[PDB]
Nucleic acid binder design. Structure first.
Lengths: 285, 145, 63
RNA sequence: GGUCUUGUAGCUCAGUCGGUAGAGCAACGGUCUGAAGAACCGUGUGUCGGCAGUUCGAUUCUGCCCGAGACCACCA
RNA sequence: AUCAGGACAUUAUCAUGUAGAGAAUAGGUAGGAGCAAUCGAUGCAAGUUCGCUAGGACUUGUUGAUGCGAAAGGUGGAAUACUACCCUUGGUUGUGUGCUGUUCUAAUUGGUAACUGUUAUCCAGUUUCAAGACAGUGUUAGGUGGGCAGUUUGACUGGGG
RNA sequence: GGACUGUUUAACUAAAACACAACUCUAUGCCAAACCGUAAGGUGAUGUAUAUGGGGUGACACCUGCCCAGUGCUGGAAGGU
RNA sequence: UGGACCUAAGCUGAGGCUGAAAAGCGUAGGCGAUGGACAACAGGUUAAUAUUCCUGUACUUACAGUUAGACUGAUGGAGUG
RNA sequence: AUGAGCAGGUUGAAGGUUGAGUAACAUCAACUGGAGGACCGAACCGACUCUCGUUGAAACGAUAGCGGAUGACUUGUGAUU
RNA sequence: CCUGAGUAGCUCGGAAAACGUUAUUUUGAGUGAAUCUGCCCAGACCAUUGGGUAAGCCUAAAUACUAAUUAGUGACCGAUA
């Protein structure tokens, strides 16, 4: 559900397809709650010390991050209700505020399959298989899509949390754990079935058809114009300089940090997600 | 290294009265039976004194292990819980059993990690074994409320 | 400091020769391993000890 | 080339690789097309990788060399 | 810690062997004019192994104290059997040299989560969970590597190199 | 020729370059690679793979042909090493 | 309007975490104001002057008395700025 | 992070509103409307260019044009590499 | 009976001694002995020979100098010094 942008201008046009952006992140005039509002750390793409971390970052249009509770173990077995869909410009997904009926408001991710007012139940128990029901992978039946994946028991969901993200289940392993999960980016992982996850898919499935259109929209969301490494200077990339078109330097063009970048995998040797794979991008781990 | 072997367990057969095998930093450096002690108390003159000490502690240690087995069969512990909407609410950590053990004026151990979170409740048995000839068994009763 | 703290076995501060053989200095660092020492009333937290220091303390029976 | 493999008909691979060099391809005798293309069935030919050793009839067998591939241009 | 596995040289073990001619499968060298007979033959019915398809060899009942031609007629370039050596070729209990498959928590860890201090982001301890001897760690050494440096790329020449 | 509204040699060339949009390629599970810091600690990003890091082309549209011989890359693998 | 109030990017920093030293990250508190919040206007006034000095007029701030009713109810939290 | 200016002339897509109409949509018709890296341009800033200047009034300006100004316009203090 | 334990030495890299690492002195990592009834040293090493007792510690002096006090001196200058 997207719509193209009509320039209607007297100086050039743009080619953009944009979501409605007023049903998700819908506030016409926003009056955010002041007792629940926070101010974030702003370096413009730099380290806390200020040193560069990525090339030419900046352009965030004053984002404010709503607090989110991904563990969802603090209100287990209590029947909440979807109270509101709160604004969240810092992400691609706009999380949902719910309220457990003992008088406890909280936040959860926004999966497709919850409506404002639905009495939901986030508990670590064999409960109804619906979105907004954060529930361990052990009791989740095979062949069902899932998100909010995590790989540390009693830690809270971290993996598969962006807007529209999901996963697939096609079996388990003979370890009392490591349920087979086809996780996005084409990785057949085996994460512990005791891990807590939300069955379904995160909201904003329309985010797969967004088109920028302008440099204004390029710089309104934390991104800045990027330059090909061909048109660099000496001592930056060996690509720049000379007459005609700028060459590509060595047999493997480099990064602005000065290292080769073609076909090389930089996987860590201390992450608990490399050994727990069935099929990797080229190998199995 | 460790020169005190009043009792004995090394994941295989080994005997007290000082009979160990090299492990470096391991069960030999961590079990309560095997703890470091200066070598100033070990010599040819001190060999007999060390043997007498090891014996005395062996007999009194077996006696006290039996006696603790019976007294834990006699003296029990107390627990309670709260419930919310027909299902359990959390998980069990050994932090709180350390709390209840200390509250009476003594302490327990840490390096015996063998347990996972107990999703169930009610009366059951926690079996932690500290010695080799007499087993230590504890009963924990949790009252649903 | 990247060195053992209880009993200070400083890294060997010398000069380094190699296929290089240039006028420089180097520190042959110590084998920092998170071991434990014998201390009363608990407080046996993991602390960095050098392995030469580790074997010397093992010879001196202090864990 | 020194830590290793190592070679066959004009070419590709078996070798009583010591005693022997054969199967397919340029080619052949014929064949059917007017004739010729197109054509199916057999081969003509034969560096046994060369030098020092072994010997019953030995470059092949061993050892040395021509080589592709890989550590070995007296010094930061 | 435990755990077994198999490897390389592997003890002892079992089978591995055809140009033809030549009783003939021709493993070779080799003592020998020797040794098979209840140490069950000349062999067989079978089982087993090997098999090149000559059929060979071990085993149980059987052949019966007779000969074995594979002592020896005969052999070729290579001759037997018994007998000894080298084997062949691999296993194998087998020791050593490098190693692989195990688990275990107990070394090792944690911007995994929580309690308390700390209503304190840095934290201390308590822990949770996750595993787990792996990696990492000091030293050593192999490789990686103009991302980077100190520097260098001779001279002659009707100018340069 | 470039997408245009646009930016640069802050003071010749400020453009047909670059940029933007768009097209495509590259690796990665929360210290995500990537990066910074000086280890700490921290960014990317306090992002969660529908996200981040980089490369090549460059309104829109059709394509992007053949080729690994080779460099880099990718994975596998006995053995020499 | 500032400071006597606090808060921005960010920072000093009791403790604490690393690191030849040096030094870095962060914490209480304290900063960081171009922000929030705080209450006054007209007339006339010096060689330089004014809600500021004087005249006619107000808000804001607690105590001593003072009379007075009301049971006050926080530092935590609810709404606000 | 705190901020601030953009006149005037503008455009008028979409969104929304209404009847005719057609088996029904279709189709026609009409108003709000206000989106735009929308337009010229005063304020604004910039600096693509002609001449002066190139022992200037200017350590980059003077003449004359020009770009943008409803947003990739202009923009201060503080603060961050 | 005692006379000072990761210290000789070995392996990989190492620091002064003429020495730019050979005796002597030195160790980041794997290591390694005894206390005279002892071990070490003695420009490979060994036996002899000799030297010494070790794997604890302090110590003024001769070692730099004349800013505080005092006095004097000059092949030092004389305001461009």
């Amino acid at each position: 559900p997207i719509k193209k942008i009509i320039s209607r201008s007297n100086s050039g046009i743009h080619h953009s397809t944009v979501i409605d952006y007023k049903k998700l992140l819908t506030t016409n005039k926003n009056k955010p709650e002041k007792s629940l509002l926070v101010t974030l750390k702003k370096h413009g793409g730099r380290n806390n010390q200020g040193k560069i971390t990525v090339r030419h970052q900046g352009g965030r249009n004053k984002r404010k991050y709503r607090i989110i509770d991904f563990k969802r173990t603090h209100y287990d077995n209590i029947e909440a209700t979807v109270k509101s869909i709160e604004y969240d410009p810092n992400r691609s997904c706009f999380v949902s505020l719910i309220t457990y009926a003992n008088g406890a408001k909280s936040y959860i991710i926004s999966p497709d399959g919850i409506k404002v007012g639905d009495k939901i139940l986030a508990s670590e128990h064999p409960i109804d298989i619906k979105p907004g029901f954060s529930m361990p992978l052990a009791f989740i039946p095979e062949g069902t899509q899932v998100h909010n994946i995590e790989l540390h028991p009693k830690g809270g969901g971290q993996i598969a949390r962006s807007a529209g993200s999901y996963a697939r289940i096609l079996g388990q392993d003979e370890t009392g754990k490591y349920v087979i999960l086809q996780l996005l980016s084409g990785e057949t992982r085996k994460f512990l079935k005791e891990c807590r996850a939300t069955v379904g898919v995160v909201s904003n499935l329309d985010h797969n058809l967004v088109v920028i259109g302008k440099a204004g929209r390029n710089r309104h969301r934390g991104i800045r114009p990027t330059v090909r490494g061909s048109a660099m200077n000496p001592n930056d990339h060996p690509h720049g300089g000379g007459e005609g078109r700028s060459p590509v330097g060595r047999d493997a063009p480099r990064t602005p940090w000065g290292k080769r970048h073609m076909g090389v995998k930089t996987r860590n040797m201390k992450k608990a997600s490399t050994n727990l794979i069935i099929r990797n991008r080229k190998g199995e781990q | 290294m460790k020169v005190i072997l009043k009792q004995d367990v090394s994941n295989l057969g080994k005997r007290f009265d000082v009979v160990d095998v090299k492990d470096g930093y391991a069960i030999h450096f961590l079990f309560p039976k095997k703890l470091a002690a200066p070598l100033t108390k070990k010599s040819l003159q001190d060999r007999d004194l060390f043997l007498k000490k090891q014996q005395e502690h062996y007999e009194i240690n077996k006696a006290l292990s039996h006696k603790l087995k019976e007294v834990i069969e006699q003296t029990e512990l107390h627990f309670s819980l709260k419930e919310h909407n027909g299902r359990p609410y959390g998980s069990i950590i050994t932090k709180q059993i350390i709390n209840q053990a200390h509250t009476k004026g003594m302490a327990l151990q840490k390096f015996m990690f063998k347990d996972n979170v107990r999703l169930g409740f009610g009366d059951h048995e926690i079996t932690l074994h500290i010695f080799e000839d007499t087993t230590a068994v504890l009963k924990v009763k949790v009252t649903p409320d | 400091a990247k060195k053992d703290q209880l009993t200070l076995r400083g890294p060997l501060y010398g000069n380094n020769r190699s296929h290089s053989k240039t006028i420089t200095r180097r520190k042959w660092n110590v084998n920092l391993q998170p071991c434990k020492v014998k201390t009363a009333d608990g407080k046996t937290t993991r602390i960095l000890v050098s392995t030469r220091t580790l074997r010397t303390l093992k010879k001196h029976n202090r864990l």
